[PDB]
Design a binder for these strands. Structure first.
Ligand SMILES: [Mg+2]
Ligand SMILES: [Zn+2]
Lengths: 52, 134, 196, 190
RNA sequence: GGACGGUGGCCAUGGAAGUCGGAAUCCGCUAAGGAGUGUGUAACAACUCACCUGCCGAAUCAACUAGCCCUGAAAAUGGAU
């Protein structure tokens, strides 16, 4: 019964994020290169999949 | 509120449809027309035009009056069984003709390319019926 | 085409200021195309108003102003969202008409209110189901004839404040006139003179 | 390439004064006192304003890596000035699906108890940083207010609360429970 | 802030309205309109996008290229510039 305005805030910290394809890190949605060393700061980033 | 609001547009035509049309799918919106309200609109809305017929209606509680916005890409198929500058001269003046326009030749320069579905050479250098509209 | 756009814009504005040496400047608010088309429909019979890049108008009058002298005072007088409106008539002709046909475009979330508007005590006239706006804002409205009714002199908005969410959403449905604004005139320039 | 000088000057309001000892900044304002040193960054600190208190930081012969620290310090000083005159107020909203989150504030607002997160009997005891005051607001149904002088401590304290309420071995996209920061406001709204 | 009429464009039809697709791309208005870059809706709708304007007053952006470094880079007794 979560009303949408609070629902959007929760999804900000849980769904609105980019994912590195090589090391599965969690990145801010506006990122361009992964911040993690072990993936070599690659650029292959995909949006985090939704629940739909 | 004029006792009613039926401003929403209807897009049925050609075959009568009735039961198989979209009107039963839109019926629970207002609860006033039901089977006896859309059919009397269909009785006058069967023609003008015999196409998808994006049209508007005004309700008189029990009765209705229907006016069809003369869509340019609809009336071309409605008149389809070339310039045809004569048929665009008459049927488009009764259109509300807002178009965010300022000049007179807006209608001819608009529909002359809306009929492309090329009639653009007539658009570029047009000289017959320059002051035809007023 | 951008360079030709710049050259064309100088040409039209310089054949319009030379046409109208009596030149007025006006500061437009964050207004939509309807109100630009409103002044266009209300003035195109004898004049025209245009919008463009602010630096462009200064460059059109920086070295190319020399066609007619005594116009040089316009450089330090054009700042902010202001332009040039050209007309042939006297000082009082355009000021009263342009400041009278102000479109009440309602209050957006985050609008300034220099004008004081106070809600009176009257019957609102809408349904008895949206009392949550009045109860949360501090106004006690009692149901009379199934209608919301303001029963007391209550403040609505101060001077020099910012409209809130609950302050604006009730303002839209209440059908009460809010603060108005529009194409407010800055000043004039009557061939080498500046007046209020 | 080594840039000769990359300076950046901040402005100090007259109601607050700054005294510099080496690379240690002492900020003394109406809402309290803030000290933070910058010995780890090789910069030159100068006070320009005997009249309006302009503070200037300088870096001589730096590479692209270390010119970034110049404004990093400047933002830190602006945060210090902001804290000692306005203070940082963080609003956290507790969101839940079936198990309502119960929050109890302990002594002086320095300790927070979370009782029924996701309906588990474990009791979470998160301790705030010193100088950070937390409280349950009266403004809304579910709001926690964190007020303190340093944005460093306050945001760290708030993030500790948020990270504590973390769902485990579940689909975090569907299970939306947890206390999340809503906005980063100020106090006294000046 | 605007994202205009044909335009719910044609043909696919059981919806494909700008966004599933086979193809053509136009103007009166303007600083704005792309019959639509995307999400999304059975479809609507809802935005946003490209397009400029208002403050904002000095350099910025893109594609490359090769030096160092990083990732790519996992084996068994504890050890090798
Ligand atoms: Mg599982
Ligand atoms: Zn990575």
């Amino acid at each position: 019964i979560i009303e949408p305005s609070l629902r959007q805030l929760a999804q900000k910290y849980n769904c609105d994020k980019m994912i590195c394809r090589k090391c599965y890190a969690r990145l801010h949605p506006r990122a361009v290169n992964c911040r993690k060393k072990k993936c070599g700061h690659t650029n292959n980033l995909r949006p985090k999949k939704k629940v739909k | 509120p004029n006792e009613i609001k039926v401003v929403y547009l209807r897009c049925t035509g050609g075959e009568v449809g009735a039961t198989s049309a979209l009107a039963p799918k839109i019926g629970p919106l207002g609860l006033s027309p039901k089977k006896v309200g859309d059919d009397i609109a269909k009785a006058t809305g069967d023609w003008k035009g015999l196409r998808i017929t994006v049209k508007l209606t005004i309700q008189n509680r029990q009765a209705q009056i229907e006016v069809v916005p003369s869509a340019s890409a609809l009336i071309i198929k409605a008149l389809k069984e070339i310039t045809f500058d004569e048929i665009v001269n008459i049927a488009r003046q009764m259109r509300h003709r807002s178009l965010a326009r300022e000049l007179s030749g807006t209608i001819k320069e608009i529909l002359g390319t809306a009929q492309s579905v090329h009639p653009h050479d007539i658009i570029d250098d047009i000289n017959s019926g320059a002051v035809e509209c007023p | 085409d951008r360079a030709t756009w710049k050259s064309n814009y100088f040409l039209k504005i310089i054949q319009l200021l030379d046409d109208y040496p009596k030149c007025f400047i006006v500061g437009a608010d964050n207004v939509g195309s309807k109100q630009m088309q409103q002044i266009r429909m209300s003035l195109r019979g004898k004049a025209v108003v245009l919008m463009g890049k602010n630096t462009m108008m200064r460059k059109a009058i920086r070295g190319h102003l020399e066609n007619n002298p005594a116009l040089e005072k316009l450089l330090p007088h054009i700042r902010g969202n202001v332009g040039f409106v050209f007309t042939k008539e006297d000082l009082t002709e355009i000021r009263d008409m342009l400041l009278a046909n102000k479109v009440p475009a309602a209050a957006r979330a985050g609008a300034i209110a220099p004008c004081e508007v106070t809600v009176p005590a009257q019957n609102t006239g809408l349904g008895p189901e949206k009392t949550s706006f009045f109860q949360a804002l501090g106004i006690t409205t009692k149901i009379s004839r199934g209608t919301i009714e303001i029963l007391s002199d209550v403040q609505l908005i101060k001077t020099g404040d910012k409209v809130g969410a609950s302050e604006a959403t009730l303002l839209n449905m209440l059908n009460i006139s809010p603060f108005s604004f529009g194409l407010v005139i800055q000043q004039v320039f009557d061939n080498g003179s500046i007046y209020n | 390439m080594k840039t000769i000088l990359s300076n950046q000057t901040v402005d100090i309001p007259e109601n607050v004064d700054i005294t510099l000892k080496g690379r240690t900044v002492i900020v003394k304002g109406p809402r309290g006192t803030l000290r933070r040193d910058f010995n780890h960054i090789n910069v030159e600190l100068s006070l320009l304003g005997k009249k309006k208190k302009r503070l200037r930081v300088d870096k001589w012969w730096g590479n692209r890596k270390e010119l970034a620290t110049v404004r990093t310090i400047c933002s830190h000083v602006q945060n210090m000035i902001k804290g000692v005159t306005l203070g940082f107020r963080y609003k956290m909203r507790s969101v839940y699906a079936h198990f309502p989150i119960n929050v109890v504030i302990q002594e002086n607002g320095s300790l927070v108890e979370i009782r029924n997160f996701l309906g588990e009997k474990y009791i979470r005891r998160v301790r705030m940083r010193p100088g950070v005051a937390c409280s349950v607001s009266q403004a809304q149904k579910d709001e926690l207010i964190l007020e303190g002088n340093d944005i460093e401590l306050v945001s760290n304290s708030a993030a500790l609360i948020q990270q504590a309420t973390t769902v485990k071995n579940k689909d975090i996209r569907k299970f939306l429970d947890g206390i999340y920061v809503s906005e980063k406001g100020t106090v006294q709204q000046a």
